Design a protein around this ligand. Structure first.
Ligand SMILES: [Ca+2]
Length: 282
C-alpha cells in the first residue's frame, strides 16, 4: 500500500526511506490514475519537505517524483503548487549541481505545461529572471531545459506571454535564431511561435526585437525541418494586424514564400501558401 510508503519518507533508516521514495516516483511515472493515487496517499507535503534535504540521492529522487506528478492533469499540477513546491524549485535554480538544476527545470517546465492559473503561479514564484539568465548558459542541456520552460510559460494567455517579454527573453531568443545548433534553433523558434500566438502587441514585440531578418534568412535553409519551424513562426506573425503584416512584407518574406510554393516537400508548399495568403489578406 501507498500510505505506508508515505510514512517511510520520514524513516530513520535510509534504505527503507530511499526504497519508498523510488517506488512512489516509479508509480508517479505511470499515468494520471497512478499520479492521483500517490497524491491521495498524502505524498506531496512529504516530497516538498524532502526538497530542503542536503542528501543528493533523496533530492534527486524527490525532484524526479514531483516532476512526474506535475506531468499529469491541471488539477494534479495545482496540488504540487498548493503543497508549496514552487519557492523551493525557484531557489534550486541557483544550485551549482547540474543534475539538481536540470530536474528543478523539468519540474518547473511541467508545472508551466498546465493552464493559465498554473503558468501564472510559476511567474509569481519569480522563475522568469533565472530562466532568462539561463538562456546565456554555455551548457546546452540547461539552455534547452530553460527554453522548454519559457516556451510553456509563453503558451498561455496574453498576460502570461507579456510576462516572458517583460522578463527580457526576446533579445536572447532572437540571438538564438543565429545558432548553428538545430536543437536550440527549434526550441527558440517554438518559444517565439508561442509568443507570436498572442495579441498584436505580443506579435509586435517579436518584430521590434529584430526576429524578422533572422526568420526570413531561415526561409532559404536547405533543411526542410528548419523551414517548417520558421514557416510556423511566420504564420503566427502574419496572423496579426496590418502593421505586423507590413513589417513581414518589408523584411522580404513574400519573395521567399512565393519561391517556397515550388518546393519538392508538399508540407512546405502548403504552409508557405497559408503563410503567404495570411500576409496578402485584406
Ligand atoms: Ca487557402
Amino acid at each position: 500500500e501507498l500510505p505506508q510508503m508515505v510514512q517511510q519518507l520520514n524513516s530513520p533508516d535510509q534504505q527503507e526511506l530511499q526504497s519508498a521514495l523510488r517506488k512512489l516516483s516509479q508509480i508517479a511515472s505511470g499515468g494520471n490514475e497512478q499520479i492521483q493515487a500517490v497524491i491521495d496517499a498524502g505524498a506531496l507535503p512529504a516530497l516538498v519537505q524532502l526538497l530542503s534535504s542536503p542528501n543528493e540521492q533523496i533530492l534527486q529522487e524527490a525532484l524526479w517524483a514531483l516532476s512526474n506528478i506535475a506531468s499529469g492533469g491541471n488539477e494534479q499540477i495545482q496540488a504540487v503548487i498548493d503543497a508549496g513546491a514552487l519557492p523551493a524549485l525557484v531557489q534550486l535554480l541557483s544550485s551549482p549541481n547540474e543534475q539538481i538544476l536540470q530536474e528543478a527545470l523539468w519540474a518547473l517546465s511541467n508545472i508551466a505545461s498546465g493552464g493559465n492559473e498554473q503558468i501564472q503561479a510559476v511567474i509569481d514564484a519569480g522563475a522568469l529572471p533565472a530562466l532568462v539568465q539561463l538562456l546565456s548558459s554555455p551548457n546546452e542541456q540547461i539552455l534547452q531545459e530553460a527554453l522548454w520552460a519559457l516556451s510553456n510559460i509563453a503558451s498561455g494567455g496574453n498576460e502570461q506571454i507579456q510576462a516572458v517579454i517583460d522578463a527580457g527573453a526576446l533579445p536572447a531568443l532572437v540571438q538564438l535564431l543565429s545558432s548553428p545548433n538545430e536543437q536550440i534553433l527549434q526550441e527558440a523558434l517554438w518559444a517565439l511561435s508561442n509568443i507570436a500566438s498572442g495579441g498584436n502587441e505580443q506579435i509586435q514585440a517579436v518584430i521590434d526585437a529584430g526576429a524578422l531578418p533572422a526568420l526570413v534568412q531561415l526561409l532559404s535553409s536547405p533543411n526542410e525541418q528548419i523551414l517548417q519551424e520558421a514557416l510556423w513562426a511566420l504564420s503566427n506573425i502574419a496572423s496579426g494586424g496590418n502593421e505586423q503584416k507590413q513589417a513581414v512584407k518589408e523584411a522580404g518574406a513574400l519573395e521567399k514564400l512565393e519561391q517556397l510554393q515550388s518546393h519538392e516537400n508538399e508540407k512546405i508548399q502548403k504552409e508557405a501558401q497559408e503563410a503567404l495568403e495570411k500576409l496578402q489578406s485584406h
